[PDB]
């Protein structure tokens, strides 16, 4: 990756020409090249080149497999000062946290809002409980009251969680994976409401994105649930429609998922300062966001200066209002596993095949069992590593019978371990990102031989280095709870 230059990657489905304008200004003032590119299958190209140390200095994403970039140590910590942070709504910094640290700039924000038909319904209901009533009142005139995609938990989990459902409890910048709120009191309440509107012939269990949309754009149902992306299809259909806050349930508000478009700095880039100056001084300004939004619109933005302008549009102010009330998508590993458990729990309840109380007990058990088997895997693997690093240091030791051969360099011991696996024809398993953090190797008298220069942990994992039926040294390894993939999780 080249020094003295900025290389930016963003999906072609977004305002890439408008970004290159912000680049051209950055060029004029600083004399630094700014090159903006839109590769195909971008979600997959980036981690492949960034995990070698090539690729772009700045990377944009809306989807990354629920935190994958961060879980891979592909992003550097961003360092905006207390000042700059207030230029952006406070919750949008929550959407870019990992291990309590910030890892990207919130550029744009999205959320489900409630889209109603002004003609068939001038005063949208503010609560869920007043919808059955309303369906009857419109079932007469030949219409339905509400139609949205029931298949995906993206559209149904706001209501389930409204009265207090949650995936895992976010306590202290970490997700207690041993604390699952899917069979919750409020979770039960949430889902059981929804199955009843299908029992009571109000909604149908088979309505998907297309059926529900193709209905609403024909004035066959008064209301729908969707986000900014669907507005352009409604527009060309000439339906006088509005966009408002989502209805409440047992008092609490619907908590849809905060979606965010993030701009991160590549952890390998020798341009992290350059890149900060770009994003903070040039992109995240009313002129910067403006130039992109013009090219292909953004939705709501996190910059308060500019959001307030865009919020002229009452649709966009509704989006941002719902996103404020929404909940932040957990970015722990193996979240896909969880949402697929939830996806079937809902499809089961709604098909009558299961009572709510069993579907959710099922989802809750399927989750605990997957997440326990996760902990099992991660743990038994890190142990096979410590063993081979031990076996490898032990072989090189018996060369001359002492620690001369070993320099105090962390990446020499890496290739010592890689050579050992190659020559013993072992399955290939080498230390994952973040391993170096609390890594030392020390001998009998706990003299430091590899590792940083400060004070060592009093306690913590230490596999011993055995030569001739005597301990000759110790590998103080890095606890699993704190490798980069797992540092967003709490295991108690």
Curated annotation (Swiss-Prot):
It is found in: Periplasm. GO terms for molecular function: carbohydrate transmembrane transporter activity; maltose binding. Its main location: periplasm. Keywords: Periplasm, Signal, Sugar transport, Transport. InterPro entries: Maltose/Cyclodextrin-bd, SBP, SBP_1_CS. Induction: Induced by maltose and the transcriptional regulator MalT. Permanently repressed by cold shock in a PNPase-dependent fashion. One of its GO terms (biological process) is DNA damage response. The complex is composed of two ATP-binding proteins (MalK), two transmembrane proteins (MalG and MalF) and a solute-binding protein (MalE). Belongs to the bacterial solute-binding protein 1 family. NCBIfam families: PRK09474.1. Part of the ABC transporter complex MalEFGK involved in maltose/maltodextrin import. Binds maltose and higher maltodextrins such as maltotriose. This is Maltose/maltodextrin-binding periplasmic protein. It comes from Escherichia coli (strain K12).
């Amino acid at each position: 990756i080249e020094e003295g230059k900025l290389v930016i990657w963003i999906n072609g489905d977004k305002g890439y020409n408008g970004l290159a304008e912000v680049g051209k200004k950055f060029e004029k003032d600083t004399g630094i090249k700014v090159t903006v590119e839109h590769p195909d299958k971008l979600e997959e190209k980036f981690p492949q080149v960034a995990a070698t140390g090539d690729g772009p200095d700045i990377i944009f994403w809306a989807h990354d497999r629920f935190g994958g970039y961060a879980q891979s140590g592909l992003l550097a910590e961003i360092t905006p000062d207390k000042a700059f942070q207030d230029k952006l709504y406070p919750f949008t910094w929550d959407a870019v946290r990992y291990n309590g640290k910030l890892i990207a700039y919130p550029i744009a924000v999205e959320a489900l809002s409630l889209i109603y038909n002004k003609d068939l319904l001038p005063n949208p209901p503010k609560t869920w409980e007043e919808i059955p009533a309303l369906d009857k009142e419109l079932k007469a005139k030949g219409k339905s009251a509400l139609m949205f995609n029931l298949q995906e938990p993206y559209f149904t989990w706001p209501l389930i969680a409204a009265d207090g459902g949650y995936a895992f409890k976010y306590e202290n910048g970490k997700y207690d994976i041993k604390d699952v709120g899917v069979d919750n009191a409020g979770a039960k309440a949430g889902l059981t409401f929804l199955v009843d509107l299908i029992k009571n012939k109000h909604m149908n269990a088979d309505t998907d994105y297309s059926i529900a949309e193709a209905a609403f754009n024909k004035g066959e149902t008064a209301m729908t649930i969707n986000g900014p992306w669907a507005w352009s299809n409604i527009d060309t259909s000439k339906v006088n429609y509005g966009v408002t806050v989502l209805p409440t349930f047992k008092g609490q508000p619907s908590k849809p998922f905060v979606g965010v478009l993030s701009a991160g700095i590549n952890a390998a880039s020798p341009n992290k300062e350059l890149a900060k100056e770009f994003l903070e001084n040039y992109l995240l300004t009313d002129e910067g966001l403006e130039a992109v939004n013009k090219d292909k619109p953004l939705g709501a933005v996190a910059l308060k200066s500019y959001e307030e302008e865009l919020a002229k549009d009452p649709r966009i102010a509704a989006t941002m209002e719902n996103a404020q009330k929404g909940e932040i998508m957990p970015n722990i590993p193996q979240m896909s596993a969880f949402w697929y458990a939830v996806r079937t729990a809902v499809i089961n309840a709604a098909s009558g095949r299961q009572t709510v109380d069993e579907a959710l007990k099922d989802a809750q058990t399927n989750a605990a069992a997957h997440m326990r088997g996760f902990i099992d895997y991660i743990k038994s693997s890190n142990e096979q590593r410590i063993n081979m690093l031990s076996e490898a240091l032990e072989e090189q030791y018996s060369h001359h019978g002492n620690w001369i051969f070993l320099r105090n360099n962390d990446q020499v011991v890496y290739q010592i371990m890689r050579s050992f696996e190659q020559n013993s024809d072992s399955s290939h398993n080498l230390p994952p990102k973040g391993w170096r953090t609390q890594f030392w190797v020390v001998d009998s008298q706990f003299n430091r031989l590899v590792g940083h220069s400060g004070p060592l942990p009093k306690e913590g994992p230490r596999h011993p280095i055995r030569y001739n039926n005597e301990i000759v040294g110790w590998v103080l390894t890095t606890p699993v709870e704190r490798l980069t993939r797992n540092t967003d999780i709490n295991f108690d």
